[PDB]
């Protein structure tokens, strides 16, 4: 092949990651290399392996090989020991997150995406980026993944992260990923699940026809809040690219006023958490 093949019997499978909520992904050991890995079990494999071999960057999970022994198929990668971003954020351990940490992580994600959009030898538009597709390696670095679940041609309850054009099956550019990245950032700031408890269909409807967007707290510093508005524009062409996001993050890092602003916001979760809850109460009733 043009990609590394790993034999099914050279893997020892442990748990299904996340009790099943992240699909048919397992933690395992690659026995001949004495290495811990993740495996995603598949029922078929198209020409994914060929693209995965040529994608490699410090903010994307590392491809190691493919299981190809019909009827068994799967993709084997790096296992990120600290798990999903979604899980971390929605746990109380994320209370340690300050300004710098949110800066570093928002940067990790933007650089991975910029790579996939513009620097990799082939152009990859994720189209399903969300905090349940970002994982955390033992060193603390974020790693995007699931960028080959589409098989690189549109296939063969995650409405909160989808741009409206994606929701309504319209032409998608790079900027669909900018919108989703917005949601991710908003998660890191609020440490809430976006549209928690709403229905999929209600989210879709609201986002597309009402231009409903996640509640940004009034204490949230301006810089960040504007970034969020920019990533969330219903006119996709207006949204920034990942290189511009990276450039905006950089001038944020040099604003000496922002640390204080962000950290007191982060530390006053006591206050603003029913700004968010109020809206959700209102939206749940709009359907009841
Ligand atoms: C190279 C990219 C190939 S792809 O086909 O686009 N994507 C692709 C292919 C194979 C995969 F295993 C995965 C994957 O899911 C993970 C990769 N590394 C991980 N480390 C930790 C966790 C984790 C651990 C614990 C919890 Cl509770 C949650 C997640 C999940 C994964 C994947 F996204």
Swiss-Prot record:
Autophosphorylation in response to ribotoxic stress promotes dissociation from colliding ribosomes and activation. The chain holds residues 6 to 299 of 800 of the full protein. The active site is at 128 (proton acceptor). Homodimer. Interacts with ZNF33A. Component of a signaling complex containing at least AKAP13, PKN1, MAPK14, MAP3K20 and MAP2K3. Within this complex, AKAP13 interacts directly with PKN1, which in turn recruits MAPK14, MAP2K3 and MAP3K20. Interacts with EIF2AK4/GCN2; promoting EIF2AK4/GCN2 kinase activity. It is found in: Cytoplasm; Nucleus. Ubiquitously expressed. Isoform ZAKbeta is the predominant form in all tissues examined, except for liver, in which isoform ZAKalpha is more highly expressed. This is Mitogen-activated protein kinase kinase kinase 20. It is linked to Split-foot malformation with mesoaxial polydactyly: An autosomal recessive disorder characterized by a split-foot defect, mesoaxial polydactyly, nail abnormalities of the hands, and sensorineural hearing loss. Myopathy, centronuclear, 6, with fiber-type disproportion: A form of centronuclear myopathy, a congenital muscle disorder characterized by progressive muscular weakness and wasting involving mainly limb girdle, trunk, and neck muscles. It may also affect distal muscles. Weakness may be present during childhood or adolescence or may not become evident until the third decade of life. Ptosis is a frequent clinical feature. The gene is MAP3K20. It comes from Homo sapiens. Residues 11-266 form the Protein kinase domain. Stress-activated component of a protein kinase signal transduction cascade that promotes programmed cell death in response to various stress, such as ribosomal stress, osmotic shock and ionizing radiation. Acts by catalyzing phosphorylation of MAP kinase kinases, leading to activation of the JNK (MAPK8/JNK1, MAPK9/JNK2 and/or MAPK10/JNK3) and MAP kinase p38 (MAPK11, MAPK12, MAPK13 and/or MAPK14) pathways. Activates JNK through phosphorylation of MAP2K4/MKK4 and MAP2K7/MKK7, and MAP kinase p38 gamma (MAPK12) via phosphorylation of MAP2K3/MKK3 and MAP2K6/MKK6. It comes from the Eukaryota.
